[PDB]
Design a protein around this ligand. Structure first.
Ligand SMILES: *[C@@H]1O[C@H](CO)[C@@H](O[C@@H]2O[C@H](CO)[C@@H](O[C@@H]3O[C@H](CO[C@H]4O[C@H](CO)[C@@H](O)[C@H](O)[C@@H]4O)[C@@H](O)[C@H](O)[C@@H]3O)[C@H](O)[C@H]2NC(C)=O)[C@H](O)[C@H]1NC(C)=O
Ligand SMILES: *[C@@H]1O[C@H](CO)[C@@H](O[C@@H]2O[C@H](CO)[C@@H](O[C@@H]3O[C@H](CO[C@H]4O[C@H](CO)[C@@H](O)[C@H](O)[C@@H]4O)[C@@H](O)[C@H](O)[C@@H]3O)[C@H](O)[C@H]2NC(C)=O)[C@H](O)[C@H]1NC(C)=O
Ligand SMILES: *[C@@H]1O[C@H](CO)[C@@H](O[C@@H]2O[C@H](CO)[C@@H](O[C@@H]3O[C@H](CO[C@H]4O[C@H](CO)[C@@H](O)[C@H](O)[C@@H]4O)[C@@H](O)[C@H](O)[C@@H]3O)[C@H](O)[C@H]2NC(C)=O)[C@H](O)[C@H]1NC(C)=O
Ligand code: RTZ
Ligand code: RTZ
Ligand code: RTZ
Lengths: 130, 130, 130
């Protein structure tokens, strides 16, 4: 489904903050006792609207809210950390949750290079005829 | 292993309640501020004992308790939400956790349709003989 | 990467404690009301330094701390239980997260036994010639 920004405005640039899971620690800075305080663990970056990604992203987050709110309504977990892990699992189950019928539309198996390994090796049983 | 109900009685019908992860929201009902209170988020349904599923299910839950209690004894999590996700992961690891030896018993790869794509395409190298 | 113990000493034996997820319960011992208290749920064992595993293990845990501390710094979860599950998911995504190109280096599909099922069944179309 296409994402069409339907907001009164779009800030086309995204000045973001995040954390780094394992920033190349400098010396002992990784030791909690010596390291940064809560305020100083953030990195920043600036992204522009190439391919319209920023305006699309603002619209996507907006459109995500209904399903996210409904998901939160139905869970009894107080804080939910597992959405991305569950999506990773669902990505795998959609592809590998059943028998992979080769050359079927729902089987992500490419036998290309290797059909050329047997059809190319027929001239070792037909052309080798003596 | 077969499930054999060994209870003094069986209620053969299951009047159930659950939640819907993303019920087709009507208007603004999905907004927590406007939506139902805790008591009003439930859907209901009624299932009968076709194939003996209800009596089997009551027995299954009964038999599950020992292993579930022992699992809970050994975890330090206060509330456990991850059992089904872990079972999904284990489903995948059992099938795809090693090398898939095609036509082996533990490899869920069907090369059927496509063995008929090469054995059917031999008459393009043997019957085409000129 | 090789693990080289660089500690002042190594205790070469590991007297360990753990829990058993589902110990073969004896009678009603699995019922929380009747079962062991927190102190009595542990099993023990003793492992020696065969293959240098114990000294390697002490070094591995030591070397793991930087990345583990940095991971903990960047999470907002108060208690983290999901590291091993996430590693299991990542194990699967590395192998099955894309299209599996058979006989490619990142495709864990063995067509061995079964290339001998078609190359062995050529003498049913070539040697059967009449
Ligand atoms: C995702 O993006 C959507 C588009 O920006 C957001 O839609 C907003 O939704 C709220 C309600 O949830 C609307 O607020 C209502 O506004 C009406 C009318 O407001 C004035 O404007 C009309 C002309 O449209 C005018 O004729 C009226 O007389 C009002 O003066 C109020 O009557 C309601 O009580 C209510 O306040 C927003 O207007 C609406 N925005 C737009 C641009 O349509 C949506 O909220 C976003 N989702 C999230 C989760 O943020
Ligand atoms: C799963 O289903 C099982 C089958 O319904 C449940 O088994 C129940 O287990 C409890 C103990 O955990 C038993 O309670 C005991 O009962 C005996 C005897 O009770 C009376 O009956 C005998 C005849 O059988 C009679 O001769 C006696 O004199 C008694 O008058 C008591 O002595 C014990 O102290 C204890 O209370 C249940 O009897 C038993 N039910 C059945 C139908 O066997 C099991 O509990 C279920 N699991 C869960 C987790 O719910
Ligand atoms: C993983 O294993 C590593 C190797 O065992 C551990 O390395 C330890 O790291 C701490 C700091 O994080 C060091 O403590 C420092 O020690 C120096 C010097 O101590 C004395 O020794 C030198 C000779 O090396 C001597 O010349 C000095 O005058 C000192 O008398 C202090 O100056 C610092 O203030 C600080 O205390 C350990 O020395 C170091 N151990 C070794 C064997 O190198 C590492 O800690 C382990 N990681 C975890 C998470 O446990
Ligand atoms: C469906 S994946 C997707 C969707 C939208 C955008 C992008 C990727 N990326 C990078 C992701 C970015 C997202 C926000 C947090 C920091 N990270 C790096 C980007 C790169 C350059 C300009 C704009 C954008 S927006
Ligand atoms: C091993 S999967 C399994 C095992 C037992 C039953 C069923 C599936 N289903 C539907 C599942 C049902 C379970 C309870 C919560 C609501 N959902 C829909 C069923 C359908 C119709 C009559 C009886 C049953 S019992
Ligand atoms: C990369 S997997 C790995 C790495 C190091 C060791 C081992 C496996 N095993 C068994 C695992 C053991 C680990 C500690 C908790 C209890 N369990 C059984 C072992 C067997 C016998 C002697 C030494 C060792 S150390």
């Amino acid at each position: 489904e296409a994402i069409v920004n339907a907001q009164p405005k779009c800030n086309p640039n995204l000045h973001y903050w995040t954390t780094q899971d394992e920033g190349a620690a400098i010396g002992l800075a990784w030791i909690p006792y010596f390291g940064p305080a809560a305020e100083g663990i953030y990195i920043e970056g600036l992204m522009h609207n190439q391919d319209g990604l920023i305006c699309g992203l603002r619209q996507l987050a907006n459109e995500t809210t209904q399903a996210l709110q409904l998901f939160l309504r139905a869970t009894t977990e107080l804080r939910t950390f597992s959405i991305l892990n569950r999506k990773a699992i669902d990505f795998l189950l959609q592809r590998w949750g059943g028998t992979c019928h080769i050359l079927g539309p729902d089987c992500c198996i490419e036998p290309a290079d290797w059909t050329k390994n047997i059809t190319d090796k027929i001239d070792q049983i037909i052309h080798d005829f003596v």
